[PDB]
Write a protein that binds this DNA or RNA. Structure first.
Ligand code: ZN
Ligand code: ZN
Lengths: 672, 250, 276, 255, 255, 252
RNA sequence: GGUAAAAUGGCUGAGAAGCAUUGGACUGUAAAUCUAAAGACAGGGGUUAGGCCUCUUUUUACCAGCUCCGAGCUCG
């Protein structure tokens, strides 16, 4: 058996992160409720996924399966042969729906262990699934609770007994003794000891922990009336060491629930992740935003019965002993961050020089990452605020709402009300997977704000319909929240397919107050679309998305006020960009200059890039760069070039490291 | 062998220097005469053929030696042998009580400047040229041969200035050999006795005082000894008395 | 002293523990707070006894066994000749500097290994045909390194033909003619220069903290260089940092007109597949 | 005996010259120190007593030596012993191929001017003063003692300039002895090895211990008092002439 | 030139003596090997051709040398060159205080008998044969070359017996040259240093690589072929007489 | 100083050996005369006083030297100075073409046996006696002084045998000095020129005395004794040959 | 910034051992020896019956995921 076993709280139930645990053992690792952004959080805090054998999902809901696709493509790139999922039986239908927009994923193997399946045991832990049905094939009233029991461990032979035993010390005769004392027996012929109690450590009985999910008050009675819980609760059979509760505080204050926890015994602990946590989840993101805020506050705005409230990286050992470890708790202090920024060799003088030198629409860059979420950059996302009362989301990547919630704090509810339409450009992953999170939060925000539930308008390729249709039919009702418009119907040479489509696009123009909306097919993949918005004020914004240097985009987006273009790679790997159907830095600059746009912005930077891109001499007053949570208005265009020196100073070391790596790669290529 | 070797001979327009030049050129080597322009060395250089080039220079002057060495490098491309056969002599007693005469300091300084200071000036300069040669398969870069008379061991009356200059060459031949040993240069000194040079009834008496042969030295014999030193690779750091077993009297 | 039983019983179990123990090392044992540190320390003592006992048996095995020009007095003559060469090198030899400023970053185990490499490096320099003029810069008196050095050399420390000083390299040579050799330098060493002074950091750094030597050099605005290892040989496995004895033997080969393909023969073959 | 003798010692303000002055004055003789004024020889002359007079002069200059000799004649009336213990040394290789360095001609000339030219300048001048002395009943008019280091026979690396100057003194000691034989002046040369002079103690301390250990017997650096003893022995012995004596200790110097 | 000359080489069956014999015979001269019969010199004489004749004789015995000289006169008719390359060596300290050992007198006498007494025995006998030759137009009757090691100037520890024998040859080379000057015989001595003669090329390797490394230039053991070249140069040069030449390579030997 | 020192002088019954004995005894030291019994050394020993003891022995014989050394140890208890002033000389040309005469081998062997073999025989034996002395505070155990004539450098016609024997002493003085350096014994050699010894003693003497540059006279054995005392007192004199000749260079 | 493998501070292994290193010896020609010193498998941790579990560093390889069915460039 394993010698150490402890739990860890990756996410503490906050509105922007959900709840997730992490069971660690020398022989196995387990994960619970892999929600949106869990992959980014675990990667940031250096949580290995190499031996993630099983993933347990407590409820068939997007708040618990949102980041499942990201974990699957990551374990695969990790080389794991087989991964086993446990939870509601709807997972099989969910896995089928995932393949609609993704590939077949032939490499890794997927297995499902529903609650109705027989119990599963491991080399370190026995797990029991408890199906719970709420009061009053898609099933919207099923929640699975887990009761994990550790294996009983033996006791070490008291090595000091060699001074009393007649056994030949240091010989092979210890092996039958070991097989005896560790199992409670003893060879009395070697002395007088008939039992291991004389010369062996007392074996440790297995200590069990229970994970309980109670999404609403409707589940309180089924939890209380469950007979299987009473087997462990009202008994002395290995009293449960710790119970993790993921339920809203309104559920906790209920008397029936309060009596339910207290019946587990006085020694039982209680850990709660109930959206009341006050803990920073993305330390690196907070560090960078605080440092950049020191340059320009407006361009880089700042972010925002006994029981134990959960925190990030909180631990609790089970196998060695049973204590609230609490050694890696994150600590956020802006004073330290600004001190480190101010002590930089060139940051202080650079910002001094810039500062002594001295409206709608506004653009907020929620995410500027290409493929995988990283410590500093999330996946592609962009918010446009046409009017104080209306807004348009330009791309909904995985965990987009989490970044939006962090950026606006308590104002997210008002912001979601102004969300008029969402545009999806080409059906790659990490470009559309965050859509279900937005829709569910939008419904909650409208209910909280007291507004009618009118369906949202979505412009996306028709292939997206099948993905959402299967998820809506099999797993959870979503489609009653949107009114999707095919992207091809908004082409310049497009034709009115149906009057309802014509009615919807007219509603989109009225809702967003735009003069016209246009789309074109870019050369990135099959059914890859750009976009262009023109307001009655006269300003035009063009979004390219994933693409290569194309002529249809240039023709359609002529005389654009602001252009956002993909800048995945640099000039060094233009061959790879052609092979991977992406554009380089100079290619995007050349396309924008040819199109004759007033300003040029870049995003969708590759994972090769850590913090900042290469600032080529071609960077003119029109070419800018994008960072997470930055705000850009039309009046800030002349200011953007002035920010280049301070950004260089704030990132002097890493750009030197990036340049050094590129130089070594070039030297290796030459010497090859 | 000495075929194809390039040699620089100081004071080779007459005396011992010319004799070595005649032999080395005859054996097939190339020689450069380094002597004052007033000695008419260009006549000897023309006589010896195209392998001999006269370089007018003064040993006591650093600039003249450097100019001559550059001429030798330009004409032939390398320097392998350096022979120092240049030197003047004076005869004056240290102090004459009966005549009330004292040795003049200028005479002592002038002899020291040419015989000793001039020899070291050449050696330190040719070695810089000599150091650039590619090492021979035996590890040798070149040979340097000096000339100090037997007065360095047994001076005569009034030969104080000459003995001091020649004595310094004998004493310094060992440190220089150790100095240039790592770079592969052999340094040797020859001690001629009474030789039939222009510098030398007295002649008949002096020739008769030599045990064997009872005659004055032949400069051709001095040239033969120089060739033997060049060919032999194990000869280093020795003073050889080419005198004829003659021990000089007061 | 509970250590007594702690061990005797492990000695009975034979779990790689020393046969005996002394008082001074016993106090060091209780000065180890982690069981792993004690386990590693005990294994270090355990292997020390085994090699000491195993080598003793070799003595027992060995116990089972005119006109001359010279006398067999050769160990004396070689020592005297090397002494004469060293004395000349102390006047005209090219200086070489070992910087002892890394005394703070080395634990006890690495400190002993640094001394052993220094003993080996000095010995190789003495035997060379054209030795360097070894300098011991920043060697603080009565320091950890100085106390260890005088213990190993005993009375020979006062007679070694090398210059040991408490000053710094900058205080003894012009700043222009100083090159600080390090593996992290951006410049690549092309050819050996006889007019320069090379500084080798007396460092071991098993617990790798790269950039220590580079930071020290850049602090005084000194030139830096890195041996052209990759250019001449194909690297497979192992850090590019080399031991002091290997570094001095590489420099000695270069100083004696050797080529790069000959100087790099002293790099361990367990890192370079072969030359290019 | 050396009682009542008057001696002129060149460079007697320090090193070997002072040691002979201390012994000769102690034995009852009179000494005149001849060394550069910057050496502070007047302090030593005052210390030794009224029999010692400091004469500031330069050996390389004819005028300075003549002035000092006149002072010695005025103070004491005669000159009987002349000891040349003055001389500088330099260390530089003839040619350094690796460093591309060549021995400078000025350094060679400067060493030759003091060690060799200076010694002969003194000898030719004192003999004129020495020649006016009435002959002793043994026929002797005086003794002249020179000092040339053992480098004249066995020089080291970079000791080319020093060996050439010392080698000239050894070679010229015989013609001078024959030159002054009719007038009755004995000329001798002493070849000290490694001696504890300031010229040698400038070397680093480790070198001195190694050099002292290289002497076969005694395994120590030379004592200037021993050098003074040898000088007194030469003066007393009337048959010692025209020889170089190596006061080294059977040490043979290595490259 | 050496064409047609007849030479007698003592100890020419091995070592330096054989090297000179090979060169002189190759140049066209005639040689006679004079070495003990146990050395197997007849094999070398047959190898060199009809111009080489082996004469078994002992240098320490007067009768053996006279018999060999008569054989040389009978075979060739004249003797022009005499080379003494025969000699043994011993290594023993004069007195070892720690071991309580004293140098044996028999060892000293045996070395002296062969190296010094044997050399003089040959010289006095060949000259009688050498005196009957008609004088050359240059007045020369022949050349006699001796061999005394560099230990005659700089001996090592335990090399007392060897140095004494070699030192006598160096000292006596001048009186013999003056003795035979009227009759027209030139006497010379060569001082080989560390040459790779059979004896020294038998010491263990580490040793052979040390000694050889101590030579300044060339840093290698002596080549007996080079020794033969020097002998030929002495024969050809008519003005070389009464000198000891150190064929060592500027090596100064240490204790 | 030489007060209280015990010295052994070979051939001290006449010539240079007696002169050193007279001076050393007069200075307060003790001397032992080692010379053949036929020389009448007992008369000189009685004349010099109770500090001089005559030891009849032959240098060429190992037994005689050992017996004499034992007598010196019994009489005085220690040996500190060893002076070798014994030696014979012969005059014969190597080869006389006109007279048809050849140097006899017996004459060469006899001269070599006494001058060179005898000197080394004494040195190797006294050092064993000399090694047992307690080291002086300067590290010295004693001084050994040899005598080889100037013929070792410049021999005359017919002086081949004499030069060979004297030449060996000059050559061997350095290895012996290195041999006895660790035990603390200093070895020196003196090279007298023409001295007024019986070996040298009319027209030839006047001519030879006139040939000396300065002083123009034959050597005085008293001067030779003075040089010996100077060597003993000076502790840094080792491994050198000193020519007590008077700048005379000998002619053929 | 990730993925996988590896890491011998004198050198090779084995998984013990050789070639080496430092101080001393006046060696009788095996000193080809005697004697004293230093022997830590990247660094931390844990455990552990080895041996494994984990963290960090370095070196060397490697780094997108368009799914359907029939019309067969568009249709759901
Ligand atoms: Zn993308
Ligand atoms: Zn894409």
């Amino acid at each position: 058996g394993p010698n150490t076993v402890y739990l860890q709280v990756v996410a503490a139930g906050s509105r922007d992160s959900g709840a997730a645990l992490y069971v660690f053992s020398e022989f196995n690792r387990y994960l619970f409720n892999c929600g949106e952004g869990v992959q980014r959080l675990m990667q940031e805090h250096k949580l290995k996924v190499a031996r993630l054998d099983n993933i347990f999902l407590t409820r068939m809901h997007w708040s618990n399966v949102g980041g499942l696709s990201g974990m699957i493509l990551t374990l695969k790139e990790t080389g794991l042969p087989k991964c086993v999922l446990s939870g509601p039986p709807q997972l099989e239908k969910y896995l089928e729906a995932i393949k609609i927009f993704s590939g077949p994923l032939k490499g890794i193997e997927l297995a499902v262990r529903p609650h109705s399946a027989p119990e599963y045991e491991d080399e370190t832990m026995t797990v029991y699934q408890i199906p719970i049905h709420s009061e009053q094939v898609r099933d919207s009233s099923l929640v699975v609770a887990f009761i994990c029991k550790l294996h009983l461990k033996r006791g070490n032979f008291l090595v000091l007994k060699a001074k009393e035993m007649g056994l030949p010390v240091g010989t092979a005769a210890i092996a039958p003794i070991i097989a005896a004392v560790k199992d409670g027996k003893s060879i009395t012929h070697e002395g007088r000891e008939i039992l291991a109690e004389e010369l062996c450590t007392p074996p440790d009985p297995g200590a069990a922990f229970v994970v309980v999910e109670c999404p609403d008050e409707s589940f309180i009675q089924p939890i209380c009336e469950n007979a299987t819980f009473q087997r462990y609760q009202g008994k002395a059979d290995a009293p449960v060491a710790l119970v993790v509760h993921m339920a809203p505080a309104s559920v906790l204050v209920d008397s029936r629930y309060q009596q339910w926890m207290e019946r587990f015994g006085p020694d039982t602990q209680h850990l709660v992740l109930n959206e009341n946590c006050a803990s920073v989840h993305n330390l690196r993101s907070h560090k960078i935003q605080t440092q950049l805020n020191l340059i320009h506050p407006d361009i880089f705005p700042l972010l925002t019965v006994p029981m134990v409230q959960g925190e990030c990286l909180l631990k609790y050992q089970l196998r060695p002993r049973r204590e609230w470890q609490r050694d890696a708790i994150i600590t956020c202090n802006p004073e330290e961050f600004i001190v480190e920024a101010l002590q930089l060799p060139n940051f202080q003088q650079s910002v001094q020089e810039y500062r002594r030198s001295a409206q709608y629409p506004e653009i907020i860059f929620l995410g500027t990452g290409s493929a995988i979420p990283m410590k500093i950059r999330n996946v592609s996302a962009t918010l446009v605020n046409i009017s104080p009362d209306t807004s348009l989301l330009l791309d909904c990547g995985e965990g987009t709402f989490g970044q939006l919630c962090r950026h606006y704090g308590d104002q997210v509810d008002r912001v979601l009300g102004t969300l008029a339409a969402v545009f999806v450009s080409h059906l790659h992953a990490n470009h559309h997977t965050g859509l279900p999170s937005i829709l569910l939060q939008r419904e909650r925000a409208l209910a909280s704000l007291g507004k009618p539930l009118h369906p949202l308008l979505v412009v996306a390729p028709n292939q997206l319909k099948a993905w959402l249709q299967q998820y809506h039919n099999q797993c959870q009702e979503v489609l009653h929240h949107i009114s999707m418009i095919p992207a091809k119907c908004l082409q310049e040479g497009a034709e009115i397919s149906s009057p309802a489509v014509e009615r919807l696009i007219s509603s989109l123009l009225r809702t967003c107050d735009l003069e016209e909306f246009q789309t074109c097919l870019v050369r990135h993949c099959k059914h890859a679309f750009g976009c262009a918005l023109v307001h009655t004020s006269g300003w035009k914004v063009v979004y390219s998305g994933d693409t290569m240097p194309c002529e249809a985009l240039v023709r359609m987006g002529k005389d654009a006020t602001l252009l956002i273009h993909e800048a995945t790679l640099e000039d060094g790997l233009e061959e790879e960009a052609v092979e991977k159907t992406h554009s380089t830095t100079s290619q995007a600059i050349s396309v924008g200059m040819r199109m004759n746009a007033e300003f040029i912005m870049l995003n969708h930077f590759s994972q090769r890039y850590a913090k900042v891109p290469l600032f080529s001499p071609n960077f003119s007053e029109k070419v800018g760069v994008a960072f997470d949570h930055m705000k850009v208005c039309f009046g800030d265009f002349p200011t953007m070039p002035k920010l280049i020196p301070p950004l260089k100073a704030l990132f002097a070391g890493d750009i030197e490291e990036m340049e050094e790596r590129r130089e070594k790669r070039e030297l290796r290529q030459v010497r090859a | 062998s000495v075929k194809g070797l390039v040699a620089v001979i100081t004071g080779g327009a007459s005396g011992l220097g010319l004799a070595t030049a005649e032999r080395l050129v005859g054996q097939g080597a190339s020689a450069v005469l380094l002597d004052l322009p007033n000695s008419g060395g260009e006549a000897q250089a023309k006589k010896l053929g195209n392998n001999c080039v006269f370089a007018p220079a003064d040993v006591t002057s650093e600039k003249d030696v450097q100019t001559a060495l550059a001429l030798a490098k330009g004409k032939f491309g390398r320097v392998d042998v350096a022979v120092n056969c240049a030197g003047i002599a004076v005869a004056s007693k240290t102090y004459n009580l009966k005549k009330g005469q004292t040795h003049t300091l200028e005479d002592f300084q002038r002899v020291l400047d040419v015989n000793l200071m001039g020899t070291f000036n050449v050696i330190r300069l040719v070695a810089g040229e000599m150091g650039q040669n590619e090492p021979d398969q035996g590890g040798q870069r070149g040979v340097i041969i000096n000339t100090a008379s037997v007065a360095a061991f047994e001076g005569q009356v009034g030969q104080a200035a000459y003995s001091a200059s020649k004595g310094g060459i004998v004493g310094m031949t060992l440190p220089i050999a150790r100095d240039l040993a790592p770079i592969g240069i052999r340094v040797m000194t020859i001690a001629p006795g009474l030789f039939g040079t222009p510098l030398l009834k007295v002649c008949n008496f002096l020739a008769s005082q030599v045990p064997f042969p009872s005659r004055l030295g032949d400069p051709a014999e001095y040239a033969h000894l120089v060739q033997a030193i060049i060919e032999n690779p194990f000869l280093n750091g020795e003073v050889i008395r080419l005198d004829g077993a003659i021990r000089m009297q007061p | 002293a509970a250590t007594r039983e702690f061990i005797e019983m492990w000695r009975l179990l034979g779990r790689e523990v020393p046969e005996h123990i002394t008082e001074e090392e016993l106090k060091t044992l209780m000065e180890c707070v982690s069981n792993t540190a004690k386990k590693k320390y005990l294994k270090y003592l355990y292997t020390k006894e085994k090699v000491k006992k195993a080598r003793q048996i070799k003595k027992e095995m060995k116990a089972a066994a005119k006109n001359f020009l010279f006398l067999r007095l050769w160990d004396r003559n070689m020592d005297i000749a090397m002494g004469w060469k060293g004395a000349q090198a102390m006047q005209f030899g090219q200086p070489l500097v070992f910087d002892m400023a890394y005394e703070n970053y080395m634990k006890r185990k690495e400190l002993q290994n640094t001394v052993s490499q220094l003993l080996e490096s000095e010995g190789w320099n003495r035997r060379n045909v054209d030795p360097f003029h070894i300098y011991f810069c920043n060697l603080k008196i009565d320091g950890a390194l100085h106390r260890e050095l005088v213990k190993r050399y005993q009375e020979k420390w006062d007679k070694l033909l090398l210059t040991s000083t408490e000053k710094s390299h900058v205080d003894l040579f012009p700043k222009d003619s100083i090159i600080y050799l390090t593996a992290d330098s951006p410049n690549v060493m092309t050819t050996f220069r006889h007019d320069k002074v090379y500084v080798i950091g007396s460092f071991v750094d098993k617990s790798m903290q790269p950039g220590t030597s580079l930071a020290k050099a850049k602090r005084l605005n000194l030139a830096t260089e890195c041996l052209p290892l990759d250019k001449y040989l194909q690297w497979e496995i192992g850090n590019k940092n080399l031991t002091l004895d290997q570094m001095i033997r590489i420099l000695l080969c270069l100083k004696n007109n050797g080529n790069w393909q000959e100087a790099l023969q002293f790099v361990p073959k367990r890192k370079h597949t072969g030359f290019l």
